[PDB]
Amino acid sequence: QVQLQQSGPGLVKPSQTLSLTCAISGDSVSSNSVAWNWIRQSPSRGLEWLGRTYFRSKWYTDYAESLKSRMTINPDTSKNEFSLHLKSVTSDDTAVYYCVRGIIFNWPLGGWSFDLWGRGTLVSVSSPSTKGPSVFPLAPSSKSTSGGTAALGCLVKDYFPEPVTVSWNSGALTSGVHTFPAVLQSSGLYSLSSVVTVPSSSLGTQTYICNVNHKPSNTKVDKRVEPK
Amino acid sequence: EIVLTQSPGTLSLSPGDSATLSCRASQSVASSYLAWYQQKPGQSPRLLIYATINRAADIPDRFSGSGSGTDFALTISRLEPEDFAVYYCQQFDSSSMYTFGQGTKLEITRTVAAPSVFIFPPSDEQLKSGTASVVCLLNNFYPREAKVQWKVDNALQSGNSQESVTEQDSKDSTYSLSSTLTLSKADYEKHKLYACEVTHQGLSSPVTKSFNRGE
């Protein structure tokens, strides 16, 4: 079926231009029965439609009235993609940005619905430079016969900006994982923990690795967590 | 120009209950252009209802849309824990092209669950760098209210910890919480007893987990 692959920088300096691209597989950027949209989301402003482009024997674009001067959406038929360019950004433009397919089911009687949404790209509008995290183990301690459950984890400390992603055993360990929201420290760097509960009996036999990926800094860390 | 106002802002209901989520438009919305979306934690929004009443493909029959004009509603019959989500309405018009409501957060009520508590000393790797992070974990509790107190050699700590909490689990509807006490290495090595004390509705009396530095 259809995949919407998003790309572009997670960090943009104030007053500079925020650019993102959506590469489509399984549908056509120039199909005359859909439209291609950008929508963003922030905790303050909620969901905000930004604009769309679509082809009906020629290309059209429509932008949100509040952004009509600052934005441009450009389709690329040779790569089957479309991109967003938002000029003169401020911290009000810090958001998760989604590329989104619009469709009218049962046209011409129907109306618009947003039926496919990409995974979304967090963009932070901020001046500091990127910094990769230090990754420290949270070791299970004296929990080898303490009820059969051991908690272990990774402390992911002193990175900028968000986000980091954490997996366990390269995605093979998912049940019992809790990865917490990051907190911003007084240094202006983020810190996050990811924990998992495992059978105490397995600590001697099973290897547990947290895989930490910080895309803005091209940092990847695999940290083995072992008992004390 | 067309403003969608959702109510209530937050709703907490038990599995098996029914939920009515309301969406009120500042002026009339053509019925073909009113849609509803569901957004679960960490995920993008998903289309639920379009053209006011029409379920998207493979959406369960428990979800139904209704209304006309200014007043619209999403009804969820026989709530399940996996329905924990924020629900948004959305419209389109020629003057204000697309707008969304601000969302209704549907929370799931369950029976009280006490947290399981764990404490983690700072790693030797981190101490090498001059700072010590002590972590306290509160796993799988309900409701969300919980108090974590850090004590160092029985001295209550203030101002030197941060915490964060997960959203309700989609399967068992519990929360988990992590609290980090951050000390300089010098301060960490100056004390012996490190303790996390936890108060919660599900505990008849507070639970303390502790360790002694170098043990």
Q: Do B164 and A98 touch (CB under 8 A)?
A: no
Please give, rounded to a whole number of angstroms, the shortest distance from the CA of A64 to a CA of chain B.
7
Amino acid letter, residue A39: I
Among A46, A48, A113, beta carbon nearest to B103: A46
Same fold, A3-123 and A134-225: yes
SS3 of A3, please? Answer: strand
- Residue A128: how many CB atoms within 10 A of its CB? 12
Q: Say how many CB pairs under 8 Å bridge A and B.
A: 127
DSSP A133-189: PEEEEE---S-SSSTTEEEEEEEEEEEBSS--EEEEGGGTB-TTEEEPPPEE-TTS-
Domain segments of chain A as ranges: 3-123, 134-225
Which uninterrupted H or E stretch holds B204? Answer: none
Contacts of A2 in chain B (CB under 8 A): none
Amino acid letter, residue B174: T
Residues A139/A225, Cβ–Cβ less than 8 Å: yes
Instruction: Name the residue with tokens 């998912």.
Output: A174
Q: Write down the experimental method used for this entry.
A: X-ray
Q: Do B44 and A151 touch (CB under 8 A)?
A: no
C-alpha to C-alpha distance for B15 and B45, rounded to whole angstroms: 22
Identify the structural domains of chain B with CATH numbers, from first to last.
Answer: 10-108 (2.60.40.10), 118-212 (2.60.40.10)
Contacts of A180 in chain B (CB under 8 A): 164-166, 176-178
C-alpha to C-alpha distance for B35 and B56, rounded to whole angstroms: 10
Contacts of B62 (CB under 8 A, 6+ apart): B76, B77, B78
Please give, rounded to a whole number of angstroms, the shortest distance from the CA of B164 to a CA of chain A.
6
Contacts of B106 (CB under 8 A, 6+ apart): B11, B12, B13, B19, B21, B76, B79, B83, B84, B85, B86, B87
Among B45, B50, B101, beta carbon nearest to A117: B45
C-alpha to C-alpha distance for A19 and A205, rounded to whole angstroms: 47
Choose, out of A37, A44, A113, the residue to mutate when testing the contact with B (most B CBs < 10 Å).
A113
Contacts of B34 in chain A (CB under 8 A): 111
Chain A nearest-CA residue for B128: A136
C-alpha to C-alpha distance for A8 and A4, rounded to whole angstroms: 13
In angstroms, the first-to-last Cα distance of chain B is 65
Residues B18/B63, Cβ–Cβ less than 8 Å: no
CATH 2.60.120.380 describes domain A134-225: no
Contacts of A47 in chain B (CB under 8 A): 45, 88, 90, 100, 103
SS3 of B81, please? Answer: helix
Contacts of A141 in chain B (CB under 8 A): 119-121, 211
Fold annotation for A3-123? Immunoglobulin-like (2.60.40)
SS3 of A207, please? Answer: coil
Chain A nearest-CA residue for B53: A110
| CA A42 to chain CA centroid, nearest Å | 13
A87, HSE (Cβ side, Cα atoms, 13 Å): 8
